Amino acid sequence: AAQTNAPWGLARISSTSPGTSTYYYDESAGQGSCVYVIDTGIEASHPEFEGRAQMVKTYYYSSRDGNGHGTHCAGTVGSRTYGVAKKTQLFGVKVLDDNGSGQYSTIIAGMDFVASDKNNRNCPKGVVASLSLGGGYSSSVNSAAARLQSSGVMVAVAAGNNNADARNYSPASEPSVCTVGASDRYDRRSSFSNYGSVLDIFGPGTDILSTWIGGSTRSISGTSMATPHVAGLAAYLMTLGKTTAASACRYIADTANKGDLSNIPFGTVNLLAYNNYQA
Ligand SMILES: [Ca+2]
């Protein structure tokens, strides 16, 4: 399948070269997979989700996304226009309040929730969790992310936006999950992206168009935006049978575009997520 005049990041993930504008993907499009977006919520009524999104848990007085961040991330995973995996099922877990903040204890509870809740959902092709959040190092937060991965969920986490080594942030620093840095449309490391040995992969993260609350769209930047590209890619590849939740991060790294990014510090991987789709 071909989607013309796609957002640059979608086009990038299906190309060996920067500077193209068509997204190419197998029409299976993540059907039969599920992606949990653990964030500020999802505006499930947005036309772009087509009835494929639902809120399953909140820790606050409402499950609505009063911020926009979670809706944007969900859109990059699985919206019809802006998403990588256009037929996946999206499940929202609201661990962050409408200011984008949350206690680590609530975030941990939300991860353990997903590890159980997947047993209540029909996801025959596999389960992914996208965590566009983080803070300072916490062994408890890292352990929760490790448990979620161990349970059979592909966990993708943002590296963070401090232009620093991600070893000092959680859950970015957990080795067993897939830690995602950000690039721009010219194949440069995004200026804010964290780096370091714990990064596994880069994805598009500067000036990413996606869904927003109030039935709208907007372009924003962050490792938060790169993460859902990788989560959606994992769902897509799992649907195709090419990998499994346990191995998907490794498979994505193995099949990535190698050596194409600039201003990657010595010792950080130079790997850009790529779907390897040949029309
Ligand atoms: Ca890792």
Curated annotation (Swiss-Prot):
Its EC number is 3.4.21.64. The active site is at D39, H69, S224. Ca(2+) 2 binds at T16, D260. It comes from Parengyodontium album (Tritirachium album). Its cofactor is Ca(2+). One of its GO terms (biological process) is proteolysis. Ca(2+) 1 binds at P175, V177, D200. This is Proteinase K. Residues 7-279 form the Peptidase S8 domain. Binds 2 calcium ions per subunit. It catalyses: Hydrolysis of keratin, and of other proteins with subtilisin-like specificity. Hydrolyzes peptide amides. It is an enzyme of class 3 (hydrolase). Belongs to the peptidase S8 family. One of its GO terms (cellular component) is extracellular region. Disulfide bonds join C34-C123, C178-C249. Keywords: Calcium, Disulfide bond, Hydrolase, Metal-binding, Protease, Serine protease, Signal, Zymogen. Coiled coil: none annotated. Hydrolyzes keratin at aromatic and hydrophobic residues. One of its GO terms (molecular function) is metal ion binding. The chain holds residues 106 to 384 of 384 of the full protein.
